[model samples]
Target: DPMVSKGEELFTGVVPILVELDGDVNGHKFSVSGEGEGDATYGKLTLKFICTTGKLPVPWPTLVTTFLMCFARYPDHMKQHDFFKSAMPEGYVQERTIFFKDDGNYKTRAEVKFEGDTLVNRIELKGIDFKEDGNILGHKLEYNYNSHNVYIMADKQKNGIKVNFKIRHNIEDGSVQLADHYQQNTPIGDGPVLLPDNHYLSYQSALSKDPNEKRDHMVLLEFVTAAGIT
Candidate 1:
């Protein structure tokens, strides 16, 4: 609970900064600068998100995400650095749990958890999804959480690969929910809001062993990945 509170404090503290810059940074267009360095100079950094209209005068998390995307590569204090390394500016709720901070030559991984909100358990990030040309297009991440924090995992889908994962937990029966399959980009518990509930269950046919079952939407993934990692 304390950990989640800490994370929340961090989340709320940045809300104002997002509000103040709600219009545009310098008057280019869109939020989080443009895309690259050239666009950064002319970008406006608009925080006008369309996720939820009229409902939220200011969506703190969404706004924070925008900044995170823009400045995620900016130099840090050097005290600590990783994929999911940005600590809430200050006064934000810090995570009660200290999961892991991994930095490898080829790739970087991070695991941060949030409690109390029931929205998510942890935000796990894996970087360096290299394209065919060897350019890092996007990093893979997961929002792992469930009824029990003791057992949960995050996964992602890339290119033609069924699933690509590096950092995981010691838990059991956990699987990654993909954007292609689930139709949601970004991580769970941090993405767009949904009605009734922002979440649902997934299953696979062969795993169920039911003759009448269909594998089309085959919910959930195999016990192990095609690459054989648990």
Candidate 2:
């Protein structure tokens, strides 16, 4: 259950967020203007996104077949709340285990631990492991007459990738910028490759606006809060 502070009023309603997306996937330009309606309770936040307009510059069959086989587990956009939870301090170590049979019949485990203001995150999928750790640059929690807000900024350079993210949220307004740039020899198939995947993705992204040349992926998200849902 969601814990209520000693003297704070319980927030027992839903909030709406206007979603904006701009980026590319495997050299294909993708953009969306959507809305997310969310509800928070029981120590959990759930959201539903409705796209008002969008474009995915790729063949449907290719995306359906290849993406499902190779990248289904790795969604382009990070869930908004997943980033927000990093600002909370209650759970020093949070773990999640998931089993999905339709998708390669695999069981995946993920863990995130908060040590002081630093965060260590790990994911294990089909015996393969991925990990990233970093420091929280800034965090603040504030309250006023009718609402509260949480702000967070974090930075890290791990696995040859640089990550810098900022998030701010309140009852009525919020924004997020989760930036990540990479220059590393990322592992592929069953082993690490000497050639970096970053270059390949960037190179593919520059091949005009043709989806047929798709080879790598990246996502950008920006959100604006709207009226509460009661």
Candidate 3:
């Protein structure tokens, strides 16, 4: 139901949902935090992700370093305009496909809509020959437009795996803060050496000094953030 205040117009505006994600991969812990606003009726939204990794294996520093350099300035660009309007322009179901490595293919499909103040999203990730393995997965997320809290579940396929995650935020300010510690050896991916123990990584949209700063971690990994956005 739309909330109406005295002398205020009937409010039917969408609010952003802030998210904080904590997880481990091959014993390498990483955290992502960001927020974005969406519209279900228009079927569009914009998401900003800040990903960080702790001390990676010898072969990973170079790869991950380059990734941060390329995307660290994304938030600056994202804040400049509305993502849903620009990305969707016009579409009920938006999708994108990309090819990586030699024959690895990745596809993402998303459908969004709103039921009053609650937003619903059905997202899918289809990987054909990804890392030389055929895999497909999906994440269904439901979030409150005003509260910014969310619940997500990874679809489990026959003979597949299942994962679940949730993002809880302040309904008044959209501020979300969370942390977790895991003893399970997380998967770091194939073709990588064992990473250092007690390794930690943190990435946050609030930590970037400047969007234009180009300080690579390989050259200087001790000033501020070990591995994070610009």
Candidate 4:
């Protein structure tokens, strides 16, 4: 009850972001635009809800990270926001030869293969603002697979990288952890943040359950292509 009220207040306090997406990919007409209607629309979310209608609680850190994750992919256009979205953050004006064929209707189609290493080849939206773009107006995403599906932690301790750093304090001298709490997963921080299965929390849960598991196995899927509109 009280928890539910806090959650509602927190959801109401979230910041709303606007974005635009233009261009075509593999001959698909993706000239669509939408704005984030609510915190739920901002990103994939996870929470324990009361079966019946009741007050909400303040969002957790995980929820904030969830929105940040969505901002990384959807609004920021880290990957191809649209099939033919521009590749700007890479700091380059370039193009790719996608596996596409033009149909008689002046439309194109292609069977594409996705890989983790080169998830986003078209653009790099590391720190770019999406509202400045030309197509996406907004998004609302509230989907949490499971706590184990979103949280990340280690075995026996359930602290994830946070605990790993505790161990590092004793193992290494005069060297504090050199990464942000969320960015510690990789050196580049370029991996997918909003994958259906790779949500940091979920990966952490796996770490707690298995001693021999590779969280990297849950790689994100991204690609690049160009499409011309008539």
Top candidate when judged by lDDT against the true structure = 3
What does each candidate score in C-alpha RMSD? 19.7, 21.4, 20.6, 23.0
lDDT of 3 by residue, 1-230 (tens): 11112101211244343333343322334444434554322223344434434432112211211121101112322222111222221212333343332333434444433334433333443445422121111111112211111111212231111212222212223443221111112121222211221212222212122355242122112111122123
Residue 32 in candidate 2, Cα distance off native in Å: 1.1
Q: Write the per-residue lDDT of candidate 1 for residues 1-230, one digit (tens) a residue.
A: 44333333433321211211222111212222111110111111222222211222211221222122111211212112111212222111111121122311121111222333211111222222223221112123222322210111222331110112222322223433211111112222332211111112121111112245332111111111011111
lDDT of each: 0.20, 0.22, 0.26, 0.20
Give lDDT: candidate 4, residue 181: 24
TM-score of 3: 0.26
How does candidate 2 score on lDDT?
A: 0.22
User: Which residue pairs collide in model 2, if any?
Assistant: 26-216
TM-score of each: 0.17, 0.24, 0.26, 0.20
Prediction 1 TM-score vs. true? 0.17
Q: Model 1, which residues run further than 4 Å from truth?
A: 13-230
Q: Write model 4 residue lDDT over 16-56, tens digit each, in one string.
A: 33222233322222321212322322332222211011211
Give the higher-TM-score candidate: 1 or 3.
Answer: 3
Model 2 reaches what TM-score against the true structure? 0.24
